[PDB]
Write a protein that binds this ligand. Structure first.
Ligand SMILES: CCCCCCCCCCCCC/C=C/[C@H](O)[C@H](N)CO
Ligand SMILES: CCCCCCCCCCCCC/C=C/[C@H](O)[C@H](N)CO
Lengths: 245, 283, 57, 242, 242, 46, 57, 49, 147
């Protein structure tokens, strides 16, 4: 009786019939910034309907030998919708999020996905192979946009930390024999109450296939993955002309 | 109220636990419907099955304290952060404050994401073979934006505003206390983004991950006299950490470090996390 | 008294710290608190799960 | 003034000593703190979070280390085979080195309390089977067959809707605390052997694949504690950083 | 007597340490104080007094530096020209180095609060006109035209009897404090760009001159504060005094 | 022209929110500004 | 007590100063006062000016 | 600070001296004791056997 | 030893005058207080910087005069000179059992006992407390003999 779920916010609604429970990251709901922690003096703007809604990104293809994908937040939403406009005409933003990942398969397939939200995901290089080069990741790798990039060495997450203890972050599983979706609610986590949206990226969302996808020949060999996200309590301040990046 | 539209929860609170929790007695159980041994790890919650729900247990009153596992006792130990030598040859060195030069303290501090603390610095200074020679020294802390000394006898050594210590080699080692001095509310060891605006290119690609809320200026020592001292000097700096508050834990690094500013690793020898064995059935 | 300027002032640690100077960050560490909250890391779940019932029914 | 004497212990620099030092900035005030979610007050809050156990740490999996997190279970022709076995030492090297508990125990020396090991099935929906997970107290080696291994603490697992079972490893030892076990004299502090056996076969219909995998998670119970902080040996610094 | 030990920190000379020292004159009495007007209790009482801003700091005005305090405004033929622009960093070098606020911020490192900039017209009586003074938060460069610059905070000024207007620069920043901005990594602490535009033309009748001047004054608001005292770099001592 | 500085605040020019700040003004006092030892003389006996 | 001879005795600073000798100028500085008066430097004007009204009418 | 002097007897290591020394492990807790029979409180209990 | 560092295993039964007093009882429970008196082998004094480091069992040990184990990020350590008064520390009761014992009748491990493993008889791991390491601080070779 808790396997079904419905999330509505804005003018959008997500329904699921085989769903796990809802994960609130660190047990805190997202909220507007109180006066005791505020430092900016200008009155903030709250669009409160046109930015608090479900936005659907692109769709990846799960093969039999896939590595994994990552999206940087809120770089994924900075060119779409009115949230793409308020983040271009202002200097400061502050918002929570609500991530929902869908991937469905039949009763004859098998596989397991590990979804996880990781804050301050700083990428690294392989340092020129032999380890003597002070290499740096380019701008296309660190901030891919709403497409998202693939992983190269997923055992070390391309940052030197192992996959084996990634579950200390808020996380869920998409096991193909029980459920087909995963959902996390993330509050705003930063050292400063407001920040720029074009030079700072708060967290990264990682989808890594631990158990490989396997099926017998003849079944539907096209397994897609689709990510859907929604800001929660977005505020903005510091108006200035449009600067994209 | 002309518009009916305009008028219009924490999960768990903390508590003190001085000792580890006791174990209560139990018996066998035969029944249907109730099952604590079956869980579902897919929801991201850990299991809540205790010992008494799987086997039968006795009653054990334990008094094991959890004092050593607090974050205050875990971090309040002085560790080496710098080795500074004066063979540089003009009797003075200017060392930029970066506390990520030695891997044993870097691994402990990178376990958390945000940290807020006050430090305590100690300087142990001798010759490069441990030998002792009577000699007068001066340390000077230079905040970011302040002018730096360029010579052994510059005008910056007058220290009209700067904090400074004068200490000899034969003395006990000097000790100071430093407060929390960041413009933000906490230090962070990871910063995903660029510090500046504008276009990011291959010439400015090294800016990625450099947060100015952690750059604290520089540090300068010199021999006091206006002439050339005839001895080689070597300074070692040790830092304790007091009044610790931390946030948002992280996985620990299992690859060896390469530089002080970025998490780059060696891409050829990816070290496996566990030591490998031969067979899965034989330990 | 002393112009209180430490790192831990909002939610602080035990009251056994010793200080002889006028600034509070010069003080000692003292003994620590025994307070802990596990359930915001081991049970970050909206609907409450009991240990007796099936969790996925 | 007042007559004094200096005792032994003068002018030493003790690294774990707690005292009062002189400040450098009079009248300084820090930045006021804001509420940041996820505050850690104690290191035992991390040790109750399950992480993945690396059971399949073979010598051939060093160039493809993504396979070390899952160990396979297939259709058998015989009965009562064992699928895996490892020691239950969280401090010794081996499968427990990949955990957040195994990395946090390395910063200490003595530990106490009970553990738990959670297994999760990741096969198809039509597949079924039953497994036996046993924990044997020390004194004997790994059991040669199933009818020896069922004498210790054991739990029988059934696949179905609920795809997770927790074998709790209870604290059975002579001393109040245990040091880190090792070959030599410190194997006196060993804690046992955990095996896993086929209760029945792994039965699959036509059209569903015949090989599934099992992931294993590990955590600590509520009466877990540690003491006597030391340094780890997993990290090193041979070459100078930068 | 009483047993003691000496800790680390012994026999050091800390320049910002506060302690008790021995006196040299026992029983001495100073001269009794009289009431002298104008007592300063705090350095923030000076930072609210306006001083003149050096906007016109060109390279050709180094031999005639009396002209750097006034910048001209003349009759235009076109519409929407800009007359001046500068950064609003009180600590960076440039126009703010000539103020009593800009010289007092150099003795510190981090500052917070809002500013204000007062302009005063010094033309004839028959002359008139309207000016637009805009402040743009960081992220963009100087605006190329008026219709870009009017999006930030802006105030429209009208000449008349009251010949002074105050554009307040409000405190909009992500951090609680700001360090001294500079080219490199510390431009993360930049604060914006202040420009000034012709709203209408500068209209003058016959017999009155066609060129007037504008002086600019700067001060701080009441919520201004500073911390972390350091030395300035504006003064030097290369040769020995006397 | 009267030699008095302006008294216009932030709220009289734009619309502002409510901000409770706790920034102390301790470091700007004249006691903390001057109580630092500085060099005044170099005296040599050749 | 002590024969009080300091530099600041008529209008003085806070009462947290420490001294072991008999002369008061040997004592420490202590923490300072938070008192300030801005209006004798920013508004030295005989007739009072209100912020709402025109100042030159 | 407070004026003092050092008396004779400074910096000597007296083996039967009883004083307070600095600890090396902050917050450490020992193993809790159990009841073990045959506790000796005084050496004169052995001399009567 | 000749490379400026020694690693000494903690065993308090090396001198007979204290061994006879402690072997009068079977089980003992106490806290200690250690004092280090250091000079040249003829009592001569030379100004010299030294470092002591206590290594618990399981911790890595330094193998050279300039190893990475000398950074002491966790280990308790003292830095002291030769001309100073002698150093003093306090050590709490740190056994896994409830009391130290000076006699242990049996073998520590399970399995078969043979003539190759006959030296295990009487070695209780509740008394092995790791090792102890000193060194001269500098990275070069000091020219003096230390005791
Ligand atoms: C006379 C006292 C001189 C000593 C002055 C020390 C003040 C500097 C303390 C810095 C506190 C840590 C700030 C940042 C630490 C790391 O270097 C950065 N996070 C680098 O990532
Ligand atoms: C900086 C302090 C370094 C000193 C560290 C000393 C800790 C070791 C104390 C050991 C206490 C006695 C334990 C056993 C004693 C005997 O060696 C064994 N019983 C041998 O039979």
């Amino acid at each position: 009786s808790d396997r079904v779920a419905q999330l509505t916010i804005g003018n959008s609604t997500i329904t699921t019939q085989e769903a796990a429970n809802i994960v609130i990251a660190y047990g805190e709901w997202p909220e507007y910034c109180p006066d005791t922690d505020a430092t900016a003096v200008d009155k903030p703007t709250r669009p409160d309907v046109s930015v608090n809604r479900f936005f659907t990104l692109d769709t990846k293809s799960w093969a039999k030998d896939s590595k994994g994908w990552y999206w940087k937040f809120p770089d994924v939403l900075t060119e779409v919708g009115v949230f793409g406009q308020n983040a271009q005409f202002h200097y400061l933003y502050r918002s929570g999020f609500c991530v929902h990942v869908q991937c469905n398969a039949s009763k004859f397939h098998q596989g397991a996905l590990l979804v996880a939200v990781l804050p301050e995901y700083v990428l690294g290089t392989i340092a020129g192979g032999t380890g003597n080069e002070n290499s740096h990741p380019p701008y296309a790798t660190t901030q891919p946009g709403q497409v998202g990039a693939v992983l190269t060495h997923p055992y070390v997450l391309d940052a030197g930390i192992p996959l084996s203890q990634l579950t200390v972050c808020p996380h869920q599983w998409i096991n193909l024999r029980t459920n087909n979706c995963a959902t996390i609610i993330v509050p705003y986590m930063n050292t400063v109450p407001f920040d720029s949206a074009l030079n700072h990226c708060n967290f990264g969302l990682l989808v890594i296939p631990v158990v490989p996808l396997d099926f017998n020949a003849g079944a539907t060999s096209e397994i897609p993955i689709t990510v859907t996200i929604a800001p929660m309590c977005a505020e903005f301040a510091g108006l200035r002309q449009a600067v994209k990046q | 109220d002309p518009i009916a539209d305009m008028i219009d929860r924490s999960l768990t609170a903390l508590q003190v636990l001085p000792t580890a929790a006791n174990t209560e007695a139990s018996s066998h159980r035969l029944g249907t419907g109730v099952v604590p041994a079956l869980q579902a790890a897919e929801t991201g919650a850990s299991s809540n099955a205790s010992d008494k729900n799987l086997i039968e247990t006795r009653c054990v009153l334990n008094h094991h304290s959890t004092q050593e596992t607090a974050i205050g006792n875990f971090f309040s130990r002085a560790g080496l952060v710098s080795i500074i030598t004066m063979p540089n040859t003009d009797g003075y060195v200017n060392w930029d404050i970066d506390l990520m030069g030695y891997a044993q303290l870097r691994r402990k501090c990178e376990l958390f994401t945000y940290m807020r603390f006050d430090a305590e610095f100690t300087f142990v200074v001798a010759k490069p073979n441990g030998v002792l020679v009577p000699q007068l020294l001066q340390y000077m802390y230079v905040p970011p934006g302040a002018p730096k000394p360029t010579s052994r006898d510059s005008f910056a050594w007058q220290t009209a505003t700067n904090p400074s210590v004068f200490v000899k080699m034969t003395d006990p080692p000097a000790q100071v206390s430093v407060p929390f001095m960041s413009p933000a509310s906490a230090y962070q060891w990871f910063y995903d983004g660029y510090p500046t605006f504008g276009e990011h290119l291959q010439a400015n690609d090294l800016d990625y991950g450099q947060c100015p809320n952690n750059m604290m200026g520089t540090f300068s020592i010199r021999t006091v006299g206006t002439e050339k001292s005839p001895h080689s000097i070597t300074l070692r700096v040790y830092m304790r950490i007091k009044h610790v508050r931390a946030w948002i834990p992280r996985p620990l690094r299992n690859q060896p470090y390469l530089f002080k500013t970025n998490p780059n690793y060696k891409g050829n020898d990816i070290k496996c996390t566990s030591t490998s064995r031969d067979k899965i059935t034989t330990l | 008294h002393e112009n209180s300027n430490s790192a831990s002032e909002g939610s602080t640690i035990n009251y056994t710290t010793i200080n002889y100077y006028k600034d509070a960050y010069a003080a000692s560490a003292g003994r620590q608190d025994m307070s802990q909250d596990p359930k915001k890391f081991t049970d970050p779940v909206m609907d409450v799960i009991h240990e007796m019932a099936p969790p996925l029914k | 003034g007042i007559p004094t004497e200096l005792k032994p212990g003068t002018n030493q620099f003790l690294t774990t000593d707690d005292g009062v030092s002189a400040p450098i900035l009079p009248g300084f005030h820090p930045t006021p703190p804001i509420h940041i979610p996820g505050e850690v007050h104690n290191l035992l809050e991390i040790c109750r979070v399950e992480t993945i156990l690396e059971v399949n740490n073979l010598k051939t999996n060093e160039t493809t280390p993504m396979q070390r997190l899952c160990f396979p279970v297939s259709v058998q022709s015989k009965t009562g085979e064992l699928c895996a076995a490892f020691r239950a030492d969280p401090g010794r090297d081996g499968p427990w080195q990949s955990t957040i508990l195994g990395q946090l125990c390395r910063y200490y020396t003595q530990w106490s309390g009970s553990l738990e090991v959670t297994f999760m099935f990741a096969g198809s929906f039509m597949a079924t089977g039953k497994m036996l997970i046993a924990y044997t107290p020390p004194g004997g080696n790994v059991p040669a067959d199933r009818i020896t291994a069922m004498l210790g603490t054991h739990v029988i697992w059934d696949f179905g809707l609920q795809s997770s079972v927790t074998l709790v490893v209870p604290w059975i030892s002579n001393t109040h605390y245990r040091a880190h076990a090792r070959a030599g004299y410190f194997d006196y502090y060993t804690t046992g052997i955990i095996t896993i056996w086929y209760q029945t076969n792994y039965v699959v219909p036509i059209g569903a694949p015949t090989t599934a995998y099992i992931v294993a998670l590990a955590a600590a119970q509520d009466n877990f504690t540690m003491k006597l902080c030391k340094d780890t040996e997993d990290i090193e610094q041979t070459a100078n950083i930068q």
